Design a protein around this nucleic acid. Structure first.
Ligand code: MG
Ligand code: MG
Ligand code: MG
Length: 801
RNA sequence: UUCACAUUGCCCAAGUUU
RNA sequence: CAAUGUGAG
C-alpha cells in the first residue's frame, strides 16, 4: 500500500501503427526559479490575480525589476530570476480602481531536478515543480480568457452560436502540463460549453419568455411568466460599472413597486432623471436578501462570461451537439489550427521563463493488438472473430442457452396503441430469433394482461409469483418514458426477486432482427445463461490458476445537487471463463470517491466465488473506474487495504496477489491516424485494439492507453489504464492482452466495449441503484441503504443486465 | 425501456447607496 | 443512467 510499481517492460505484441497525439513537446531551461508565498487581506481568484497584476506594475522600480511574475491566483508566485528582497518579509498595499499583500519567498524550484526525474534517475516526479510550470502556462490566459476547470473559454469573434433562452456556445480549449517518457508535454484539446449572453436584461426576458419584441407584453407579467423569468435570472450577476448578484424578481411592477417611502420609477424619475420605458415590468432585487435595493430591468446588463450551470433544454442540447459534433480528422485539424493560432512562444510570461512549445502534434507509435476468438456453443461450437471490434450472432448458439418454459407478459401501454396483434406478432418474432440463438421460448406466455399506472405493478407481480410455479421471466411493455419502469424494477429486484425484461412499446410495434437479438442477450443472461466465452486456449497464462475479476465504480449526483448520496458498486467474476458476475452496492457520503464499505463488499463476492467455483482465488484483479491522478494515493491506501482485510478476515494466511488498476475513460488525450488509409469509418478513427504504452505515457510508472472499441461517431476516447499495485508481477504484454480480452466478455452486445466488462457492469449496477432511489433521495442512511438492497433471490443474479 | 459509440452532467480541478 | 446525436444482422 505504497507508491505504485515501476513499468516492468514495454509491450511487443501486435502490428505497429503511426499515431499523432494532442501532446505538444516542451523545451524547459536548466535553471532555478523562485517560489513566493503571498497573502492578500482580505476574494474571488480573478480578483486576487488583478490585485497582483496591478501591484507588480506599481512596485516595479522598488522590487520587481524587468521581471514577469506568474501568479496561481491565490498564494503562489514564481519568478525566473530572484526578487531583490532576499529571505525576508515585506508587507505591501495596493489601490482599487484597499489591499494589504504579504510577499515572502519560501522556496527555490530546481527545474533541473525535473530533467533528471524524467530520465528516471530520480525515482520521484517532483509535483511542486510541475505545479509551477502549469502556473507559467496559465498566467496569461487566466486573465484574457474565462477559466473553467483546467480549460479556457472565450466568445468566438466574427460568429455567434445561440442556443436560445438567452444562451450561446463558447468555444475553448483544455490545457495541462504533464511529464512523460520523452519530455514535458503540453496537452491541448478543443472544447465548448454554454454561456449566458451579455445582452440587455430586457432582451434576456424576451428569449426566455418567447417574445420577438418588448411590445408584445404591454402590461405586467402573468403569474406564469414572472416565476419562469425568476427561475432563470436568479443567481446570475448583472451590471449597470458596478456588480450585482441577482437574488429575486419582485412582485409589483416598477411604477407601483416601493421602497422606504418612495417608488422605484419615481425614484429613477428625478434622482437619475430618466422616465422608464417598460414601467410595467418588475424590478430585480439585488445583493443581500435583508436589504432593500431594487434595480429596473432597463438599466441592467447581463454581465459577460458567466457559465451556464443549469441543465440545457432538449433543443438547446440538440443545438449544442450539432455545433460541436466533429469527426476525428476534423477534430485533429481543429486542435492544430488553434495551436498555431495560440502561439504559446509569443506569450511574454512564457518567454520570461524561456519555455518553448512545439508547433506540431507529437508522433507516437502504437500497436494494434489481435482480438481474441469468441466461443459459442450449441452443436456447432462455432467461433466468432471480431473484425475492427465487431462481430455478430448469426448462425451461432449461446454457449449455455436457457430453455424458457414458464413466462408472462405485462403491457402498461394503452391497448389502443399496443394491440393483442402487435404482442402476438412480437412474440412469434422473438421466439424465432431466440430458438436460433439456443434460447428456446418453448411455449406461449402463461399470462398476458394489460395494466395502467405504477399502482398496478406490485399486485400484478405478487399474483404471478403466487400462481405460476417455476416462473422464469416477466416481459413488460412500456409506453415510453414512465415512472412505471422504476417501479417495475423496485418490485422485481428488491421486493419479490423476479426476473423482468422491459421493452419500449415502439420496439414491439416495429421489430428488427438486430434489436431482438440484442434483447435475447439480455434475457439469456438474466435467466442464468452463458452467451459466449473467450476461446479457452487463447487466454493469457493467468487463467491457469483460480482468478477473480473485480470491477468497481462510484457515481456521484448531478451538478448543483447538495444532499444526494454517492453510489459505490463492485462486481466479481463467478466462473473461470470469465463470464458470470455477481454484484454488490452501497450508498455512501455525498461526493466521496473512496469506496467506504469495500471490505464487506469484497468478502461477499469472495464467498460467492467459492460457492460457485469451489476455488479460492490465488490472484485478484481489481479494475477501478474514475479515479484521478490527484486521488491515486488516498484511494489505493484505503481500497487496497480493504481488499486485504477482506482476505484476512475470511481465512488465516489467505493472501492472494492483488493487481490494482485505475481505469480513466474521461481525460484529454486524443489519438489520431497519421496515415489516412489507417482511419476507420465515417468518423475516421484509429482501429480497435490500438495500444500506446510509450512516448506520451508515464516516465517511471506502469500505465498505458488502450482503445479497445470501434469509433462510430466523433473522436474516440482511448481508455487510460494505470497500475497502482501489482503483487502478481504482470508484464506489459500480458496485462494489455488481458485487459483487451475482457472488453470482449461484455454480454449486452457482440462488440468490443471501451472498458473491461467488470467495470462496465459496475456502472450498470450503480445506475440501477440510482433508479431504486428515485424521489427517495443515521436514520437517513438506513432508509436509502434498504432501497438499494436487492431481494435474496436477486443477490446472485445478473439483474443489472 | 435492444445495444454500443460520441457531447454534457461525476472524484481531483474549477467555482463560492435603493 | 438522463438529455441529444450517429450507427447496427
Ligand atoms: Mg464514477
Ligand atoms: Mg474542491
Ligand atoms: Mg441516450
Amino acid at each position: 500500500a505504497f507508491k505504485p510499481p515501476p513499468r516492468p517492460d514495454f509491450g511487443t505484441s501486435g502490428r505497429t501503427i503511426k499515431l499523432q497525439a494532442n501532446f505538444f513537446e516542451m523545451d524547459i531551461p536548466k535553471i532555478d526559479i523562485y517560489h513566493y508565498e503571498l497573502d492578500i487581506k482580505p476574494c474571488p481568484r480573478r480578483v486576487n490575480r488583478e490585485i497582483v497584476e496591478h501591484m507588480v506594475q506599481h512596485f516595479k522600480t522598488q522590487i520587481f525589476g524587468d521581471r514577469k511574475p506568474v501568479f496561481d491566483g491565490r498564494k503562489n508566485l514564481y519568478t525566473a530570476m530572484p526578487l531583490p528582497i532576499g529571505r525576508d518579509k515585506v508587507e505591501l498595499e495596493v489601490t482599487l480602481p484597499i489591499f494589504k499583500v504579504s510577499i515572502k519567498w519560501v522556496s527555490c524550484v530546481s527545474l533541473q531536478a525535473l530533467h533528471d526525474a524524467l530520465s528516471g534517475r530520480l525515482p520521484s516526479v517532483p509535483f511542486e515543480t510541475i505545479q509551477a510550470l502549469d502556473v507559467v502556462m496559465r498566467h496569461l490566459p487566466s486573465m484574457r480568457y474565462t477559466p473553467v476547470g483546467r480549460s479556457f473559454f472565450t466568445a468566438s469573434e466574427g460568429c455567434s452560436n445561440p442556443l436560445g433562452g438567452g444562451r450561446e456556445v463558447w468555444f475553448g480549449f483544455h490545457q495541462s502540463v504533464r511529464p512523460s517518457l520523452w519530455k514535458m508535454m503540453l496537452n491541448i484539446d478543443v472544447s465548448a460549453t454554454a454561456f449566458y449572453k451579455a445582452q440587455p436584461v430586457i432582451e434576456f426576458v424576451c428569449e426566455v419568455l418567447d417574445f420577438k419584441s418588448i411590445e408584445e407584453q404591454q402590461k405586467p407579467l402573468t403569474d406564469s411568466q414572472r416565476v419562469k423569468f425568476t427561475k432563470e435570472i436568479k443567481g446570475l450577476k448583472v451590471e449597470i460599472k458596478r456588480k450585482y448578484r441577482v437574488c429575486n424578481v419582485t412582485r409589483r411592477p416598477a411604477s407601483h413597486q416601493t421602497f422606504p417611502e418612495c417608488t422605484v420609477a419615481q425614484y429613477f424619475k428625478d434622482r437619475h432623471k430618466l422616465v422608464l420605458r417598460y414601467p410595467h415590468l418588475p424590478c430585480l432585487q439585488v445583493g443581500q436578501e435583508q436589504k432593500h435595493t431594487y434595480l429596473p430591468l432597463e438599466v441592467c446588463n447581463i454581465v459577460a462570461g458567466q457559465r451556464c450551470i443549469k441543465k440545457l433544454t432538449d433543443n438547446q442540447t440538440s443545438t449544442m451537439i450539432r455545433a460541436t459534433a466533429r469527426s476525428a480528422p476534423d477534430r485533429q485539424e481543429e486542435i492544430s489550427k488553434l495551436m498555431r493560432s495560440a502561439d504559446f512562444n509569443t506569450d511574454p510570461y512564457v518567454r520570461e521563463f524561456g519555455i518553448m512549445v512545439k508547433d506540431e502534434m507529437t508522433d507516437v507509435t502504437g500497436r494494434v493488438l489481435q482480438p481474441p476468438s469468441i466461443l459459442y456453443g450449441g452443436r456447432n461450437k462455432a467461433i466468432a472473430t471480431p473484425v475492427q471490434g465487431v462481430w455478430d450472432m448469426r448462425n451461432k448458439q449461446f454457449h449455455t442457452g436457457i430453455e424458457i418454459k414458464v413466462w408472462a407478459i405485462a403491457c402498461f401501454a394503452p391497448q389502443r396503441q399496443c394491440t393483442e396483434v402487435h404482442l402476438k406478432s412480437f412474440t412469434e418474432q422473438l421466439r424465432k430469433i431466440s430458438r436460433d440463438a439456443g434460447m428456446p421460448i418453448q411455449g406461449q406466455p402463461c399470462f398476458c394482461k394489460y395494466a395502467q399506472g405504477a399502482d398496478s405493478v406490485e399486485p400484478m407481480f405478487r399474483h404471478l409469483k403466487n400462481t405460476y410455479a417455476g416462473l422464469q421471466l416477466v416481459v413488460v411493455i412500456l409506453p415510453g418514458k414512465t415512472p412505471v419502469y422504476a417501479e417495475v424494477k423496485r418490485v422485481g429486484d428488491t421486493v419479490l426477486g423476479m426476473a423482468t425484461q422491459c421493452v419500449q412499446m415502439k420496439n414491439v410495434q416495429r421489430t428488427t432482427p438486430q434489436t431482438l437479438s440484442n434483447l435475447c442477450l439480455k434475457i439469456n443472461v438474466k435467466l442464468g445463461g452463458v452467451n459466449n466465452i473467450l476461446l479457452p486456449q487463447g487466454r493469457p497464462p493467468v487463467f491457469q490458476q483460480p482468478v477473480i475479476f473485480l470491477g468497481a465504480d462510484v457515481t456521484h449526483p448531478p451538478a448543483g445537487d447538495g444532499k444526494k448520496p454517492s453510489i459505490a458498486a463492485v462486481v466479481g467474476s463467478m466462473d473461470a471463463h470469465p463470464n458470470r458476475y455477481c454484484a454488490t452496492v452501497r450508498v455512501q457520503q455525498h461526493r466521496q470517491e473512496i469506496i467506504q464499505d469495500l471490505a464487506a463488499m469484497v468478502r461477499e463476492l469472495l464467498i460467492q466465488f467459492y460457492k460457485s467455483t469451489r476455488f479460492k482465488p490465488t490472484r485478484i484483479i481489481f479494475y477501478r473506474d474514475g479515479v484521478s491522478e490527484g486521488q491515486f494515493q488516498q484511494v489505493l491506501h484505503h481500497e487496497l487495504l480493504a481488499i486485504r482485510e477482506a482476505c484476512i478476515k475470511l481465512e488465516k494466511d489467505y493472501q492472494p496477489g492483488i493487481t490494482f488498476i485505475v481505469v480513466q475513460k474521461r481525460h484529454h488525450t486524443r489519438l489520431f491516424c497519421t496515415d489516412k488509409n489507417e482511419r476507420v469509418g465515417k468518423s475516421g478513427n484509429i482501429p480497435a485494439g490500438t495500444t500506446v504504452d510509450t512516448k506520451i505515457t508515464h516516465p517511471t510508472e506502469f500505465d498505458f492507453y488502450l482503445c479497445s472499441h470501434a469509433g462510430i461517431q466523433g473522436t474516440s476516447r482511448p481508455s487510460h489504464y494505470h497500475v497502482l499495485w501489482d503483487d502478481n508481477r504482470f508484464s506489459s504484454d500480458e496485462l494489455q492482452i488481458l485487459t483487451y480480452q475482457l472488453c470482449h466478455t461484455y454480454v449486452r452486445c457482440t462488440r468490443s466495449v471501451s472498458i473491461p466488462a467488470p467495470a462496465y457492469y459496475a456502472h450498470l449496477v450503480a445506475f440501477r441503484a440510482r433508479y431504486h432511489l428515485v424521489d427517495k433521495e443515521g436514520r437517513d442512511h438506513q432508509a436509502l441503504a434498504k432501497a438499494v438492497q436487492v431481494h435474496q433471490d436477486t443477490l446472485r443474479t445478473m439483474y443489472f443486465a
